[PDB]
Amino acid sequence: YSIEKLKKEENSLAKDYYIYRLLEKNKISKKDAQDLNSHIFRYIGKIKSELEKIIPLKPYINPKYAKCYTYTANTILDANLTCQSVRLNSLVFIASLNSKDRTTLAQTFKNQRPDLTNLLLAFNTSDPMSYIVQKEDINGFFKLYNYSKKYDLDLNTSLVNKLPNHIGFKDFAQNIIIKKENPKFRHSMLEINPENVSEDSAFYLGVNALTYDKTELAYDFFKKAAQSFKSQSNKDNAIFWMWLIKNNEEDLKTLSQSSSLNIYSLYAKELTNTPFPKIESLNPSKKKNNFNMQDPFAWQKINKQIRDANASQLDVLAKEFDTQETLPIYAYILERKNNFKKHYFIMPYYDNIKDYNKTRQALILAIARQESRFIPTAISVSYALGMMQFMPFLANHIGEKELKIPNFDQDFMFKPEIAYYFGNYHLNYLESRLKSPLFVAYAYNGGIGFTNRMLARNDMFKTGKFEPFLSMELVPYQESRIYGKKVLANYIVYRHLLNDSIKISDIFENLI
Numbered sequence: 001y002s003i004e005k006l007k008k009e010e011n012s013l014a015k016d017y018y019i020y021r022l023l024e025k026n027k028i029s030k031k032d033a034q035d036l037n038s039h040i041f042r043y044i045g046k047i048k049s050e051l052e053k054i055i056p057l058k059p060y061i062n063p064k065y066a067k068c069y070t071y072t073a074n075t076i077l078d079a080n081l082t083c084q085s086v087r088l089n090s091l092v093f094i095a096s097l098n099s100k101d102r103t104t105l106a107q108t109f110k111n112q113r114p115d116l117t118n119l120l121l122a123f124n125t126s127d128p129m130s131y132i133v134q135k136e137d138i139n140g141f142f143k144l145y146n147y148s149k150k151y152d153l154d155l156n157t158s159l160v161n162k163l164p165n166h167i168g169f170k171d172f173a174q175n176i177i178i179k180k181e182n183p184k185f186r187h188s189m190l191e192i193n194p195e196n197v198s199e200d201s202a203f204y205l206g207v208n209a210l211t212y213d214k215t216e217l218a219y220d221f222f223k224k225a226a227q228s229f230k231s232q233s234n235k236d237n238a239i240f241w242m243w244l245i246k247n248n249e250e251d252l253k254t255l256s257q258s259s260s261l262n263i264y265s266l267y268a269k270e271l272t273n274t275p276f277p278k279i280e281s282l283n284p285s286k287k288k289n290n291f292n293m294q295d296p297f298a299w300q301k302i303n304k305q306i307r308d309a310n311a312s313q314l315d316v317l318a319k320e321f322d323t324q325e326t327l328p329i330y331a332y333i334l335e336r337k338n339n340f341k342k343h344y345f346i347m348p349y350y351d352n353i354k355d356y357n358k359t360r361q362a363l364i365l366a367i368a369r370q371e372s373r374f375i376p377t378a379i380s381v382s383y384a385l386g387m388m389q390f391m392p393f394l395a396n397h398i399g400e401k402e403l404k405i406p407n408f409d410q411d412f413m414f415k416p417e418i419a420y421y422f423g424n425y426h427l428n429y430l431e432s433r434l435k436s437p438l439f440v441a442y443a444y445n446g447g448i449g450f451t452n453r454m455l456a457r458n459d460m461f462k463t464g465k466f467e468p469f470l471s472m473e474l475v476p477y478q479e480s481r482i483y484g485k486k487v488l489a490n491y492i493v494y495r496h497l498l499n500d501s502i503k504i505s506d507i508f509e510n511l512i
């Protein structure tokens, strides 16, 4: 597709993907590139660095404060007060000033903007964080953390209990807990009253408490998370921790009876001799319809309609797509139609994998369900492609260099036969080194590099009281932490559907 045909398609990730393929082959001239960032759905990462090689944009500076950005540290005292106050939004700018100019500006702004006064006078010390913490300036605390992570200080009970009322708290808490940074911040957060936190923050404060072996504080935080979390899946994770810590059998009972299918509810069912949850059976009689499952533009179109449809229009779409050929779209519609209530675990293009052993089948299907929901022309924001969501680098390495497929193009990843085949090949590579399907999942999502480095650590997937569950909470990238949990449930389920059951307790033992 040329830049002309693309310009006449709707903005979407597919169209971005194709513009990016033109850019990477140097087929976009400086003239084609004029009208172009209005043809881009998500102007972020490599498509934007590539377009800026051709047309390097300088904007944006808001036209009303333009004059404020003509001053420097050496001339800021010549600027009007509006200009002074705008420039002082930057802690780097404040750090650049000399110390008597910070004193001067601190007085100027003491009545009207004490927040600026506090930062100005804090940067006149050798420890700005210490100064801000003594004022209990909460906005300033978060501005300093974002300026530099290296500041670390003990925080008293009054101060830590104010932090959660600021929007930055949740990312701050998660980030220092899972990265194991800022030990003094971490230790201080033991004294946060569970009444003051909720949802993920509460959860991560329970994980924090466990790392300091404060099991009673942890329980209290996990209990608060269970009460406040919106998603049943997250509640279950919290209820599991409550159970593991204090061993109340009503917690486990509640968890065994969850409507969410996840590793926590699966495990609780297995410990209480509860039957495996009901998996829906989608068996459309109709063979095909008009829809091209190989057209990435048709998928982008129909996805947006599906996601924006009322309860009425979902019924019309469910009927249209109730066919074997469009089975992944049918299931996608039924997941939205039933408000995420029933359990769909389809096995499309099954002929391409029925000859692998059943364990491999289940891992392939588990990965695919998480990666794409089996959509053949799925495209991620980093332009990973097809059912098994291969980055183009890897797809080209396997297809051209290893399998020297005649006339391989990366868009072959949109073919089910190719996706499953390449997925099997890549999963052999990963499983041969990592063994556990959980670790394979982590490596499939985040690379074997990061997986091998996490597994090399002294404190990860070793023996302990609360292992391997604690380690699964401390996987250092949020996306991978979540991916692995999801893929593991899927794997358990697909092993069951294929009459190759395994106990999830065995999976957990093999993690240590």
Ligand SMILES: CC(=O)N[C@H]1[C@H]([C@H](O)[C@H](O)CO)OC(C(=O)O)=C[C@@H]1N
Residues within 6 Å of the ligand: 371, 380, 384, 388, 389, 390, 391, 394, 426, 443, 444, 445, 446, 447, 448
């Ligand atoms: C199969 C495959 O290409 N795996 C890759 C992974 C996936 O592309 C990702 O989970 C799909 O969204 O991303 C990344 C990544 O670092 O973004 C690396 C993995 N090698």
